[PDB]
């Protein structure tokens, strides 16, 4: 029974990963073929830039604004900056904007979404000058609606590019997200790659490679059939036509009986999907963002993401039929993502309850080999030798993602003690259960029989695995001491911060 479980788990992971790699390679070939026909000095689509921020550090906000100003695209109608401020602290962010751009910071009294006239002309008067707006704190969706209205004011605008207050773009991060929109008439949304620059801590180092794998592999295969599930927060381009149609059933979102205050990018992509439109992902557009360093904050972020995932999965399954044959792969991916967590949980429970050293060692070695292959592919693709650190990510997935996913279902399906134990008690219980299972397996199997071949195999395998993880951690420590793990962007940003 254990052999069946291990073999089925290994195949069910590796075969699907290989298929995703093949589909992503085909998508990359198609994108390169499309790009090869682009004439030199191409500027046809008129784009509007929308940035939404809320209490961002002045240094990163200034860097983001300057990088946006550094774009090589020559057809930009207007820059729109929306701030959830109007108290006092965000006046400093407005001052940073005034340092980077013109002195045009409007102070509307009410949000456009709640206004009786959802028109941009109410608060805006010029369509050619960059505008910064301070609005009452209502969330990111409400601020994005104002940006959409302001971009829809101009009848010559053909597309919008959405950037976060922290994302730092490259010199050609706008030209690459707006070309696929003009390649196929059925494409109405383009997704851009997101990278992590503050790869100093171990957790950030693992999260960077997780992002790389979930962008290059997970979304390229989806974009081969032009059915990208999530466009993405840091970078993303949309057509004004589809936005003028989907922006109405997007601010009044309801799930069971309450408004939604999380996501704001996955549902927007899903609404495009339900209308039969096509969405692509370009790997040639790069946007740099940061990742949380503390483990608890990362767990909170993961559970917040899973909260929206557990609804939009059914929402996308209810509309996958409209696309046609393309969508069978989408439903298969949805079922794979649903069943993978259950398979992992069941396998862990089965190998923990039955304290057998052979099965545990075989599972550990099989998982190590699978993650080694996965990290090797990423190292080959990214030309970076640090991608092998991804072999450690399994630990995170067993200590920061599974409890977060469990909490995301146990709290959504339904003083300070309730505010703190509502998001961390399940994680503590999971850690205690894992530790108790380990102690039980060690105590139950407490013997040394070197005359048995299988005991030798189990002990040698576990020792080799410990040596492998130890040398990986030692390499990480040596790299951190030598500052070899620092990204070039982080190396420049540290010097800029020192100079300030």
């Amino acid at each position, epitope marked *: 029974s254990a052999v069946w479980g291990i073999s089925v788990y290994g195949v069910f992971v590796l075969g699907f990963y290989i298929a995703q790699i093949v589909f992503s390679e085909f998508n990359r070939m198609r994108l390169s073929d499309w790009i090869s026909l682009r004439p030199d000095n191409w500027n046809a689509t008129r784009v509007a830039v929308i940035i939404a921020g809320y209490r961002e550090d002045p240094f990163m906000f200034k860097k983001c604004l300057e990088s946006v100003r550094d774009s090589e695209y020559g057809n930009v109608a207007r820059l729109i900056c929306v701030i959830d401020g109007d108290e006092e602290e965000d006046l400093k962010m407005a001052e940073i904007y005034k340092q980077v751009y013109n002195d045009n910071v409007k102070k509307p009294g009410v949000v456009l979404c709640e206004s009786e006239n959802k028109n941009g002309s109410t608060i805006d008067s010029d369509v050619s000058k960059n505008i910064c707006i301070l609005q009452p704190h209502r969330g990111k969706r409400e601020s994005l609606y104002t940006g959409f209205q302001l971009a829809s004011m101009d009848p010559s605008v053909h597309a919008v590019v959405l950037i976060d207050s922290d994302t730092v773009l490259e010199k050609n991060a706008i030209l690459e997200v707006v070309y696929p929109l003009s390649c196929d008439p059925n494409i109405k949304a383009v997704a851009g790659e997101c990278k992590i620059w503050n790869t100093d801590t171990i957790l950030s180092m693992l999260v960077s490679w997780r992002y790389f794998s979930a962008f290059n592999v997970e979304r390229g295969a989806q974009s081969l059939w032009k059915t990208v599930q999530c466009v993405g927060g840091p970078l993303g381009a949309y057509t004004i036509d589809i936005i003028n149609e989907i922006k109405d059933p997007w601010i009044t979102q309801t799930f069971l009986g309450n408004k939604c205050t999380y996501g704001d990018n996955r549902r927007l992509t899903n609404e495009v999907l339900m209308r039969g439109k096509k969405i692509v992902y370009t790997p040639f557009a790069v946007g740099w963002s940061d990742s949380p360093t503390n483990v608890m904050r990362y767990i909170v972020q993961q559970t917040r993401w899973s909260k929206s995932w557990c609804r939009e999965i059914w929402y996308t399954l209810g509309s996958a039929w409209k696309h046609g044959f393309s969508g069978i792969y989408l439903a298969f991916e949805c079922m794979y993502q649903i069943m993978y967590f259950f398979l992992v949980m069941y396998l862990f429970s089965y190998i923990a309850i039955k304290a057998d050293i052979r099965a545990q060692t075989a599972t550990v070695l099989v998982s190590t080999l699978v993650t080694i292959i996965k990290s090797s592919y990423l190292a080959l693709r990214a030309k970076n030798l640090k991608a092998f650190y991804f072999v450690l990510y399994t630990y995170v997935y067993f200590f920061c993602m599974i409890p977060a996913r469990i909490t995301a279902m146990f709290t959504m399906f339904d003083a300070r003690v309730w505010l703190w134990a509502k998001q961390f008690l399940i994680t503590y219980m999971w850690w205690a259960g894992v530790l108790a299972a380990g102690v039980y397996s060690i105590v139950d199997n*407490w*013997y040394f*029989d070197w*005359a*048995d071949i*299988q*005991y030798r195999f189990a002990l040698v395998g576990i020792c080799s695995y410990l040596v492998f993880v130890s040398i990986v951690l030692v390499i990480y420590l040596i790299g951190k001491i030598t500052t070899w793990n620092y990204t070039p962007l982080q190396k420049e940003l540290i010097e800029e911060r020192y100079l300030h």
Partner: nanobody, 124 residues
Framework: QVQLVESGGGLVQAGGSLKVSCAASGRAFKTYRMAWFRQAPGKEREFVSGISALETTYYADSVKGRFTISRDNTKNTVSLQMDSLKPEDTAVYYC??????????????????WGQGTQVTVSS
């Protein structure tokens, strides 16, 4: 510490079959490795059969197929079944248990615990 109690054994004619079994009382029988030893009239103890904690069976020469060793954790006892009895098989059988050991498993001194043993006689 584990206590071993023997059971089975008797007078069986040549070419017959006989099953013996030793039961162990202890905190955890699963981790123990069991072994069956023979003491001939020549009075020289030798290894005959063994079963490890991972259900691996070890047999001595000339008893590779004649002797079959089985283990049952539910009744925490190990049973040896012998077929095609031979005149040289009349001897005293002992059951031994081990918890910690190395490459050596054929030596009598490598097993910490021992049992009373039972006399098995074969008539031709």
């Amino acid at each position: 510490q584990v206590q071993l109690v023997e059971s089975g054994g008797g007078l069986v004619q040549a070419g017959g079959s006989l099953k013996v079994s030793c039961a162990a009382s202890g905190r955890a029988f699963k981790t123990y490795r069991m072994a069956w030893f023979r003491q001939a009239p020549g009075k020289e103890r030798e290894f005959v059969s063994g079963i490890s904690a991972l259900e691996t069976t070890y047999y001595a020469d000339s008893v590779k197929g004649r002797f079959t060793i089985s283990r049952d954790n539910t009744k925490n006892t190990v049973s040896l079944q012998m077929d095609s009895l031979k005149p040289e098989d009349t001897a005293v059988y002992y059951c031994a248990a081990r918890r910690y050991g190395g490459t050596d498993y054929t030596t009598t001194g490598s097993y910490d615990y021992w049992g009373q043993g039972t006399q098995v006689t074969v008539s031709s």
